[PDB]
């Protein structure tokens, strides 16, 4: 199958900016590529097809170029209505169409490192036979942030999940919570619980941790 890789993952922008998103195909596809716009909770909307043809009634500030493997979508002067997620799609083959992973165009602000806080399980939860640890990343920009959990130095893979807020309408940041869930029994078998956070506003990854017994 053809993999479509868009970049960047989030494009920071302001009203009036000239904004360009890129989309790369893992196989050549001539001009058989379309661009979609999508807002949260709503269906996608076709902007451009055949790489450079406008769907009728779409504003002419939208343009596209490329043919082969490298394609660009340009918004010449961003409007408030244009903050959204944008997808490319290839239809080179009749047999299998694929979309890129999406590019979110959000409201540009200064870089802000997250405040990272960690919450051991409540003694309350411990009596139910499970133990959850929560790592809060508060008020950060841009959206890209990596959370890694370690228990006594062991990378945890499969027992965590993440949730992110929409861009704050006031301060334009994001916040993120990750929950690591273990059995009571193995929680009481280990000592160090560590949330490692990677974010552009940090000079290096930050680790917030606690030892099980202490508070």
């Amino acid at each position: 199958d053809i993999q479509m890789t868009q970049s960047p993952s989030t494009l920071s922008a302001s009203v009036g900016d000239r904004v360009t998103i890129t989309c790369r195909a893992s196989q050549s596809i001539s001009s058989w590529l379309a661009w979609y716009q999508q807002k949260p909770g709503k269906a996608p909307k076709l902007l451009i097809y055949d790489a450079s043809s406008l769907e009728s009634g779409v504003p002419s500030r939208f343009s596209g170029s490329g043919s082969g493997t490298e394609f660009t979508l340009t918004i010449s002067s961003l409007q408030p209505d244009d903050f959204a997620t944008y997808y490319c799609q290839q239809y080179n083959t009749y047999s299998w169409w694929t979309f890129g992973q999406g590019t979110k165009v959000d409201i540009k602000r200064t870089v802000a490192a997250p405040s990272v806080f960690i919450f051991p399980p409540s003694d309350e939860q411990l009596k139910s036979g499970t133990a959850s640890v929560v790592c809060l990343l508060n008020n950060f920009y841009p959206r890209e942030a990596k959370v890694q959990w370690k228990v006594d130095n062991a990378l945890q893979s499969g027992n965590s999940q993440e949730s992110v807020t929409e861009q704050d309408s006031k301060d334009s940041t994001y916040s993120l919570s990750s929950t690591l869930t273990l059995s009571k029994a193995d929680y009481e078998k280990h000592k160090v619980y560590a949330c490692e956070v990677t974010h552009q506003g940090l000079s290096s990854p930050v680790t917030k941790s606690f030892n099980r017994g202490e508070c």
Binding site: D1, W32, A34, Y36, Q38, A43, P44, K45, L46, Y49, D50, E55, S56, Y87, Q89, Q90, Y91, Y94, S95, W96, W97, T98, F99, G100, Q101, G102, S115, F117, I118, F119, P120, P121, S122, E124, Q125, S128, S132, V134, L136, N138, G158, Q161, E162, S163, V164, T165, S175, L176, S177, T179, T181, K208, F210, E214, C215
Partner: protein, 220 residues
């Protein structure tokens, strides 16, 4: 709007329907595209005007696309459903007549499919207590962990709605167990932790659960 979606246990079947008014379903190619919560678009299947059908690897052998021209309706039969098939499903097509084969200018509203073995279950509401671990520049973070409930939704307020600013109630996540979990957090001045109480109010109507949880500060 697409229908036939909703809740189904793993191994079960659903039959989506996409009834259209504005064009005939059989003169066009029609497709299904799905989107998991928080994720991108995944093309699922296509039926061309000539009747040919094609499927993404991930669904071949389990899904069947079809149309009934009499009712002007597109279908997706979904068998042997798995948790990873949880998604919003859109039917889509192209109304512009042009020589092109694959762009989509018509999209349905979308309909949510959730694949879970879970029965109705009220949340456990666990405190996220403020402490040194959650204070910074004179502001402390605290919250409530609203764990293992089904189905959606829950509502969370703080101090019965008196406390709204600084509150972040995160989108729920469907866990590998088939139960949902979410957190709600709030940042407040740390000087307030001893002098004022913070309570999160969690309502889960399906289970008739209404919990008020006091979040006491840790003295470490």
């Amino acid at each position: 709007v697409e229908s036939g979606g909703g809740l189904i246990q793993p191994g079960g079947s659903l039959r989506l329907s996409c009834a259209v008014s504005g064009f005939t379903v059989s003169s066009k190619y029609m497709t299904w595209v799905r989107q998991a919560p928080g994720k991108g678009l995944e093309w699922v299947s296509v039926i061309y005007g000539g009747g040919s059908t094609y499927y993404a690897d991930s669904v071949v052998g389990r899904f069947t696309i079809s149309r009934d021209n009499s009712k002007n309706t597109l279908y997706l039969q979904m068998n042997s459903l798995r948790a990873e098939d949880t998604a919003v499903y859109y039917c889509a097509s192209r109304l512009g007549v042009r020589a092109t084969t694959g762009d989509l200018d018509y999209w349905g509203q979308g309909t949510l499919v959730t694949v879970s073995s879970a029965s109705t279950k009220g949340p456990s509401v666990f405190p996220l207590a403020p402490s040194s671990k959650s204070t910074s520049g004179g502001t402390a973070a605290l919250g409530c962990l609203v764990k293992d409930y089904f189905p959606e939704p829950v509502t969370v307020s703080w101090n019965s709605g008196a406390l709204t600013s600084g509150v972040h109630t995160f989108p729920a996540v469907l866990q590998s167990s088939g139960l949902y979990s979410l957190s709600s957090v709030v940042t407040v001045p740390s000087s307030s932790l001893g002098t004022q109480t913070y309570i999160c109010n969690v309502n889960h109507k399906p289970s008739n659960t209404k919990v008020d949880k006091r979040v006491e500060p840790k003295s470490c």
